[PDB]
Amino acid sequence: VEPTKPHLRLLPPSPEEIQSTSSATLTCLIRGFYPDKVSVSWQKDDVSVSANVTNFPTALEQDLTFSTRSLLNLTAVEWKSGAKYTCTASHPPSQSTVKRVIRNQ
């Protein structure tokens, strides 16, 4: 056993979701961590938020690492405001905390 720290990708919503559904989902892609014990939290302008946050169970990858995702289900109005959103993943086995930041358009 040699624990590996996670790596993040904070991605903007698909233009069709904003232009059709008027919703803007931010996807946080957490990959490469082992073992699977992970906690993902969100914050709007360095202030914690839990509303419309969808956390998914960890998935087993073929390179024997684990991967999970976190979804922040924002409205298009809130996403077009220009507020800073941060996805932060805490991984206790490796004692590491990785962060990713996205700004709006």
Next chain:
Amino acid sequence: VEPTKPHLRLLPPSPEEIQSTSSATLTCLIRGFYPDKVSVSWQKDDVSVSANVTNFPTALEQDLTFSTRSLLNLTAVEWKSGAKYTCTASHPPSQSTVKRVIRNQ
């Protein structure tokens, strides 16, 4: 055994990747398919492309479905051109083909 068809999400690049690395990676998120036998292909304006396409092995999800991803590693110049990109996933077990389209900004 009752095969399930995959569902796609075609996502744009993170603004920081375009503004810092001058590269624009398009992520195709294929989820919910069972069994894992899947083929993902890309096309630029309905014309097949294989250059800078990174396909990943299938991952086992906790709901007993499989999920995979496909990355189209475009340059920021090619992404800002306005060309239509289509991610299409073929799933032989369910005999289904799902498509997702993204347009540029």
